[PDB]
Amino acid sequence: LDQLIYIPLPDEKSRVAILKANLRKSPVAKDVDLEFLAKMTNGFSGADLTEICQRACK
Amino acid sequence: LDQLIYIPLPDEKSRVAILKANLRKSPVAKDVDLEFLAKMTNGFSGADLTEICQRACK
């Protein structure tokens, strides 16, 4: 194992795509703005976004 | 000295008022949205906001 690849925290477009990919199974109303939702969450990881999606589902 | 008062980091309306109070001397164009500017800066102090205002002035 000689290649080293660093994987940082996700950027804004990445957060948009994570929030889209987590919610394909759920019926989401079209009134919801995900692009505003990715702007507030500066410094989250993927697991935090999955956590908040599942909490809204609960 | 028997009273103890805790002073936390400023909230969102407080950040709006800090950004307003720092920029009274400067000619600011009316196209600038400060209320959007206070939403991004979750967890700044007052000195950080004065720093970024003076850097824009520079």
Side-chain angles (χ1 to χ4, degrees), chain B:
Chain B
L1 303 179
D2 53 355
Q3 299 292 322
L4 296 175
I5 294 172
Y6 176 71
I7 294 171
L9 292 176
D11 289 331
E12 183 176 359
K13 292 173 69 175
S14 297
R15 289 193 295 269
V16 173
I18 290 167
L19 289 169
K20 288 180 180 179
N22 291 319
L23 294 173
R24 291 180 295 173
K25 290 173 69 176
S26 296
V28 180
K30 294 179 183 179
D31 202 5
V32 178
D33 194 3
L34 277 74
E35 290 83 4
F36 181 76
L37 190 64
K39 292 184 177 68
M40 294 296 114
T41 64
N42 192 3
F44 286 2
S45 66
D48 296 329
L49 300 174
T50 62
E51 179 70 29
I52 190 168
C53 291
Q54 290 181 356
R55 188 174 178 87
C57 184
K58 290 184 178 70

Side-chain angles (χ1 to χ4, degrees), chain A residues 35-55:
Chain A
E35 290 83 4
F36 181 76
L37 190 64
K39 292 184 177 68
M40 294 296 114
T41 64
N42 192 3
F44 286 2
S45 66
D48 296 329
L49 300 174
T50 62
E51 179 70 29
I52 190 168
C53 291
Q54 290 181 356
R55 188 174 178 87

